[PDB]
């Protein structure tokens, strides 16, 4: 449980610099791994994860003096690149202990900066941030994956002002004339890399990342996504929208002019209209097959966890279900069952409502579509359950009261009471009962209770309008557009290389060795009228 | 005075029971009016499902809103 | 968005209808628009098979339309 | 224009103490009246009113040293009780210059207190606050009339902690045991007096008083009104409500069973039902006459200015109009015109809606009734104008399009288009036209524009829901209840003296002379857990 | 204005608490497991020489300041 | 409904010798930024006559803070 803990860990925990100094002087092993269950993540038990090492323990506890001693003592220096059983180094541990609170973010940022400076000074040829843990994540990738927006924000626009540490910066100042200055953002492992770019990690999160909506608001990421949109993806997205418009028009035309004789499949007549009809049907089935395979590819690549399946990946599910209805329609069509129509129309309806998928790329319409999606996913079940409880209760009461009437059934009475909700309730739809007072009292009570329900729905949804819905929907729309951008880049359709944006600029030209550093920078201009 | 602002669900269940028992009495009294009682109980029997929305945060909150709407505000506007 | 929903469900319903009195985009679009103004018949035709499909489409259209209007209300309230 | 201005006024204006001292030493007249048009209220011209006297000029300009010198010089002491052409003294002038701002209220309060102390010291037998101006108003009554809530609030709970000034206080501390103490408020010229009590002045304001809603929130007034309600007026108000319920029930019964034969008046048949009917009719006419004379008495006593007529005095107008409809019905009845029914039903409808008058006395119901009243008075005309513009425009277009149809008239087409607002629009109500596309386009445009109008009405009214409507309606309800209390006290119905509340208590018993002062004080218990 | 949401949430919490207490009072099978949180020695130094077991509830917290 | 006094008592911790036993909140251990504390639960979970949970839950509705008293940390966590 406490396996691996030794006196050096105890000394660091108690914040006793003298005891740590004596223990290191007396031959304590500064690389000892406290790999007991207490020192692991272990969400189902109490504990504290810090990287299992004395150096990462000192770093995680905001003890800079002990870190400086351990790294560069006289007897046994600590290995700044050491990895624990998970593969995490000190920087990975510092990312892990972040929780996006103010003081935690401040001290974690400061400790991260100090670790980088000391590592560069002691080991100029060591690139700490390129070291990956057993999951293959760098500290930047780990911060992006875990949603540590504070540490991510610090790293992305990190600028270090001192000699022999410029190469560690990721934000550079290219020039400054007056109040205007032009800065450069590094974008290594953000735009693209071998395994885990920041954009890929954020966009393809599992929806359990706490700040997936907010991480994209960090300046270089938002500007990079807007640039990618305007330069490369806008035209391709509009072309896809146009093609989908043509597909849905052809599907609507083919379905509208279906033959009405029974027993499909139908013989092709030697006439122009039927050649157009069968061509449209073939194109409709082809598009359905295309969306079917696209949905399968998406689900295989992402592997949703059946809870992230719906709160994310919503549009992919809708397109896949549309294709499923299309394929079931084809199977029923060739099975000589008229019921294929029942499938086809559903696909047709879905095929038009999925037009809302393309509202992303338009800020306001995309926000409205996001509101619709989240209302369906979050709020619909609660209100529909309560409304259906009231409807079914009063329908059962009324149909029990009715004796051998025209209605006298759950379906007819439920529909007739539902008509009150749409402003079409008759209120005298039958007289096949005794106790007219009971009938009218039940209907009036149902009407009043239904209006109470709808009024409470309105009030309850108004509780979230205090700046929450607008900003939340806007950020969700931005995330959806980012996902669209990344998918479009992955497809790219013509083996084009212009998707690699921001050009190849020289930051310093003086690395720790005599080589230069071209690092694919992105330029951002800013104006500051104070702090001259 | 605390009878309705608290203990609301207990009253609704008790009133459902009262309608059921009146229905039984009318049934064995050879009065068709028992149906008039029974249907009311039936209606209440379904709306009392809202009692079980507690244990679900959002649904329970919505049911609480309905309860307080009826108890607090309904009489003023209906008058 | 409203016209997208209206046209999609109109196309589905008119496709479902066979040789009816309505049986056209104009008539079905108008008849579904009547739901928005509180005049939707909900049984305006029987010239179809699969009554369950017809009623399911109409109920889904009604619920989605009320969701649209409610979200429109909330979105405009966001700026008040 | 500058008539009456002397060198002393100029010296005070320039804030030159030395020049004022020299001028008074050299025989300047400290009672000179600067009664030029520039120094009067004169809302249509520039100027500055200060009371026309050097003493009130110094007081209004926040120059306490000059006030002390003028009152306590050696050569010619200023007359602290002097009155200007309007009859205003220095205290009236200080009330006049108040505008309910923070700094103005602070310095006016301080100057008022200092002048009272100086007047008591120099003239212990002089009661400055009992001096009335030409309008008959004391400084307290003037503050209440003009809506100077800051000065009124200061005066009503004024307490002066020093010997030989206790008699000037209006708030007195009866006892204090621990954190709990009992205060006594004076009530002189608040509960009742000869000419202008504070309650009468506030309640019967012309609606131009800026703070008539807020002045009643000052502690002694709110407590006194609640006490008056609970002790005296609650039962009488409920009795009046019950009597009005009986009156409306009798009127409804008499109107419901009217005979259907033509040509009134109708012969009384020797049968029980007709005796009850004619008795109910006689009682209905008697009540109408009663409300008619009550309305005339109200309008004669108050004399509304035809702008305050509607924004205030709303319920009195509704009751008077009900009585007018009743009397017109009687005249038509005996004139052998069946049109009397047309009048009677309107009165009947109004007779029931005037039940809302009695929602005062119930906080929430009264607030809701106030919301209804203010929505009708303030907002209805704007939205009705815009809606009627749209309705009439589209009705004229549609009826012009219709050619020799069954509708083919402004009334029928306007009614059919109005039906869309209530969820009953046919949308195919006629086919007597050419250009069906034009007809349907006009109707759809009308529907969409009408929903836009209603939605913008909703948003515009929501624009004022940020704590304004609730608090404003609550304060208006409190004012209405105060008016009801005062009217009930004025009626009093049995020559009862119990309306004089709070009992006759001995506040100090040590006036400037050897007399003891009983001042009819109101007791309030307060608890303070700090400032031991 | 932020009032009805929080008020309804707190009322729901109170209603659930009432449900919990009623369920414990019923308990349906003469079960004793409803007495939770276990018997722990808090201090072990009472005013006399005895130790105190007080049936305590364990809660973990993290504070990144006041080291 | 004296929520202030209730909140003070329920999580009372006294840091001095010879008065530790009076504490109802006790710190079991503290490793680093994380620590584990113990709440007493005496007369809260159960007792002879009037437990805190029974008193709060079965109030007459005249208790001013019956809604808010359950938000005190040990009670909310215990109920969950
Ligand atoms: C959530 C699931 C996947 C869902 C899939 C189908 C069955 C759907 O019924 C629902 C259940 C339902 C039924 C009736 C009213 C509301 C909700 O809602 C959606 C789903 C509900 C929708 C709502 O419309 C939209 O969400 C459009 C849309 C918005 C945002 C998007 O990012 C999007 O990407 C495709 C699409 C429309 C239907 O697909 C449709 O057209 C038919 C015939 C039924 C609707 O199931
Ligand atoms: C408040 C009293 C006890 C009440 C009891 C009956 C008669 C009731 O009529 C009312 C009066 C009424 C009638 C019509 C419209 C609104 C209110 O409302 C409730 C009461 C009103 C309701 C409202 O539904 C609910 O409150 C469900 C509910 C919500 C929260 C809960 O904690 C709950 O616990 C059981 C139940 C439904 C009826 O019981 C019902 O189904 C019938 C036939 C009439 C409703 O009287
Ligand atoms: C403002 C004037 C005096 C008014 C007087 C009459 C004609 C009235 O029509 C109005 C015009 C009107 C017509 C139709 C809809 C709205 C407004 O509104 C009121 C006035 C409008 C009302 C509104 O109902 C109320 O104001 C009740 C009420 C609320 C608060 C009160 O303090 C109150 O004291 C009596 C009464 C009801 C009518 O009197 C009524 O019952 C009939 C037949 C027409 C209404 O004219
Ligand atoms: Na309607
Ligand atoms: Na309707």
Swiss-Prot record, chain C:
Na(+) 1 binds at residue 38. Residues 22-44 dip into the membrane without crossing it. Phosphorylation by CAMKII seems to regulate binding to vanilloids. Phosphorylated and modulated by PRKCE, PRKCM and probably PRKCZ. Dephosphorylation by calcineurin seems to lead to receptor desensitization and phosphorylation by CAMKII recovers activity. Coiled coil: none annotated. Changing residue 31 to Q: Slight modification of pore attributes. Changing residue 46 to Q: Minor modification of pore attributes. Residues 45-52 are extracellular. Changing residue 31 to K: Abolishes channel activity. Restored channel activity. Changing residue 43 to Q: Minor modification of pore attributes. Na(+) 2 binds at residue 38. It comes from the Eukaryota. A motif (Selectivity filter) lies at residues 38-41. Ca(2+) binds at residue 41. Responses evoked by capsaicin, but not by low pH and heat, can be antagonized by capsazepine. The association domain (AD) is necessary for self-association. Homotetramer. Interacts with PIRT. May also form a heteromeric channel with TRPV3. Interacts with CALM, PRKCM and CSK. Interacts with PRKCG and NTRK1, probably by forming a trimeric complex. Interacts with the Scolopendra mutilans RhTx toxin. Interacts with the spider Tau-theraphotoxin-Hs1a. Interacts with TMEM100. Interacts with PACS2. This is Transient receptor potential cation channel subfamily V member 1.
């Amino acid at each position: 449980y406490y396996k691996g803990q030794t006196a050096l860990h105890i000394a660091i925990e108690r914040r006793n610099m003298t005891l740590v100094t004596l223990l290191v002087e007396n031959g304590a092993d500064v690389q000892a791994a406290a790999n007991g269950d207490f020192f692991k993540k272990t969400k189902g038990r109490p504990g504290f994860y810090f990287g299992e090492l004395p150096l990462s323990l000192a770093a995680c506890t905001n003890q800079l003096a002990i870190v400086k001693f351990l790294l560069q003592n006289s007897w046994q220096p600590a290995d700044i690149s050491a990895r624990d059983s998970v593969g995490n180094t000190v920087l990975h541990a510092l990312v892990e202990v972040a929780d996006n609170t103010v003081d935690n973010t401040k001290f974690v940022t400061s400790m991260y900066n100090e670790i980088l400076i000391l590592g560069a000074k002691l080991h100029p040829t060591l690139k700490l941030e390129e070291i990956t843990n057993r999951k293959g994540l760098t500290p930047l990738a780990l911060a992006a994956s875990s949603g540590k927006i504070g540490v991510l924000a610090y790293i992305l626009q990190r600028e270090i002002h001192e000699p022999e540490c410029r190469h560690l910066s990721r934000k550079f100042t290219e020039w400054a004339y007056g109040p205007v200055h032009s800065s450069l953002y590094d974008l290594s492992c953000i735009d693209t890399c071998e395994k885990n770019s920041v954009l890929e990690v954020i966009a393809y999160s599992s929806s359990e990342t706490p700040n997936r909506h907010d991480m994209l608001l960090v300046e270089p990421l938002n500007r990079l996504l807007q640039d990618k949109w305007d330069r490369f993806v806008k035209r391709i997205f509009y072309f896809n929208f146009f093609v989908y418009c043509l597909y849905m028009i052809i599907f609507t035309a083919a379905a509208y002019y279906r033959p009405v004789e029974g027993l499909p499949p139908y013989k092709l007549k030697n006439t122009v209209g039927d050649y157009f009809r069968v061509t449209g049907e073939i194109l409709s089935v082809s598009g359905g097959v295309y969306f079917f395979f696209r949905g399968i590819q998406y689900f295989l690549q992402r592997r949703p966890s059946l809870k992230s399946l719906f709160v994310d990946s919503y549009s992919e599910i809708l397109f896949f279900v549309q294709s499923l209805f299309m394929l079931v329609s084809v199977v029923l069509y060739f099975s000589q069952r008229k019921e294929y129509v029942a499938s086809m129309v559903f696909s047709l309806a879905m095929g038009w409502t999925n037009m809302l998928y393309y509202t992303r790329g338009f800020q306001q319409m995309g926000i409205y579509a996001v509101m619709i999606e989240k209302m369906i996913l979050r709020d619909l079940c609660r209100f529909m359950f309560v409304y259906l409880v009231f409807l079914f209760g009063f329908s059962t009461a009324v149909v029990t009261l009715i004796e051998d009437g025209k209605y006298n059934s759950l379906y007819s009475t439920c529909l007739e009471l539902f008509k009150f909700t749409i402003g079409m309730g008759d209120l005298e739809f039958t007289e096949n009962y005794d106790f007219k007072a009971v009938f009218i009292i039940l209907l009036l009570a149902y009407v009043i209770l239904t209006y109470i329900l709808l009024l409470n729905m309105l009030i309850a949804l108004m509780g979230e309008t205090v700046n929450k819905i607008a900003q939340e929907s806007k950020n969700i729309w931005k995330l959806q557009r980012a996902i669209t951008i990344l998918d479009t880049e992955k497809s790219f359709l013509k083996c084009m290389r212009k998707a690699f944006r921001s050009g190849k600029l020289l930051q310093v030209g003086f690395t720790p060795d005599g080589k230069d550093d071209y690092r694919w920078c992105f330029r951002v201009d800013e104006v500051n009228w104070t702090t001259w």
